[PDB]
Amino acid sequence: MNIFEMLRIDEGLRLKIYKDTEGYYTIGIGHLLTKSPSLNAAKSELDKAIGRNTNGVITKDEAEKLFNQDVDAAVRGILRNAKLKPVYDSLDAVRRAAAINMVFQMGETGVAGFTNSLRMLQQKRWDEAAVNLAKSRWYNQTPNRAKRVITTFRTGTWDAYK
Ligand SMILES: [Cl-]
Ligand SMILES: [Cl-]
Ligand SMILES: [Xe]
Ligand SMILES: [Xe]
Ligand SMILES: [Xe]
């Protein structure tokens, strides 16, 4: 298992514009197009991201390309964030994938706000971190996904995804 397969399981794959769990227009493997309630706005953003007139529909290869760009951007964002980088660098490979999934889902600002859990992770207090991460709007809104990510930080194995 790796970060790509992990995220492909959590995000699914959809070739037509769809609304995500928060009701925002998205396409592909969780690629958020806009927070705007406007379908046309989402369609304009899609065409711009793909480089053609897609008419709200893309191919699998195009979805995979947006996904590659999005994973890369997510990791790079962590390395560029002063509150995140030190935590991420202290983690093992498995746990780093869990950090990346959270960032892909909620953005780096969002993750950088889990101050207390960040500290627990950095000190390798796994069970404690797991309990603190669950006290969040993130966990109450997407509990199955949050549980899988949380168990990954807690155990450092891919069991939740097998
Ligand atoms: Cl883009
Ligand atoms: Cl869920
Ligand atoms: Xe992190
Ligand atoms: Xe994190
Ligand atoms: Xe976190």
Side-chain angles (χ1 to χ4, degrees):
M1 170 74 48
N2 59 56
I3 186 55
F4 288 94
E5 294 180 3
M6 184 198 206
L7 286 158
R8 163 80 172 65
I9 283 155
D10 285 333
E11 294 298 350
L13 165 63
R14 293 169 82 184
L15 301 185
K16 312 235 191 193
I17 293 181
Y18 66 94
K19 297 201 189 158
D20 71 6
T21 65
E22 302 286 325
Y24 298 129
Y25 291 118
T26 299
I27 194 143
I29 307 155
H31 179 80
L32 172 70
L33 291 163
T34 181
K35 297 203 193 162
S36 159
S38 171
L39 181 59
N40 284 325
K43 291 161 151 150
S44 166
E45 292 292 315
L46 180 55
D47 290 347
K48 161 159 74 77
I50 299 300
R52 77 186 173 76
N53 232 89
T54 63
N55 187 36
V57 187
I58 67 177
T59 73
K60 215 231 272 224
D61 283 346
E62 283 166 342
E64 282 173 347
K65 187 164 189 185
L66 293 185
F67 185 43
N68 276 320
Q69 285 176 173
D70 288 350
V71 175
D72 190 1
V75 193
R76 202 68 171 276
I78 286 165
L79 298 191
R80 291 175 165 163
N81 184 299
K83 285 290 172 197
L84 292 183
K85 184 187 174 269
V87 185
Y88 181 84
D89 278 343
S90 75
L91 299 173
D92 50 281
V94 183
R95 294 182 178 91
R96 286 179 179 181
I100 301 159
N101 189 309
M102 286 184 74
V103 166
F104 188 91
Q105 184 182 4
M106 78 176 64
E108 109 214 32
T109 303
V111 182
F114 280 62
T115 296
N116 305 325
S117 289
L118 291 171
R119 180 188 54 260
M120 285 164 207
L121 291 176
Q122 176 160 213
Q123 289 166 128
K124 319 195 172 282
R125 288 173 185 214
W126 318 120
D127 285 14
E128 285 164 63
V131 167
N132 186 271
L133 284 167
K135 299 167 170 190
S136 56
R137 171 180 197 268
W138 169 58
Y139 177 85
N140 288 96
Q141 293 313 119
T142 50
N144 288 325
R145 191 198 180 138
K147 291 191 214 264
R148 290 195 286 276
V149 169
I150 291 169
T151 286
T152 301
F153 276 127
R154 195 170 53 74
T155 65
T157 69
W158 293 110
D159 299 343
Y161 282 84
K162 312 199 121 136

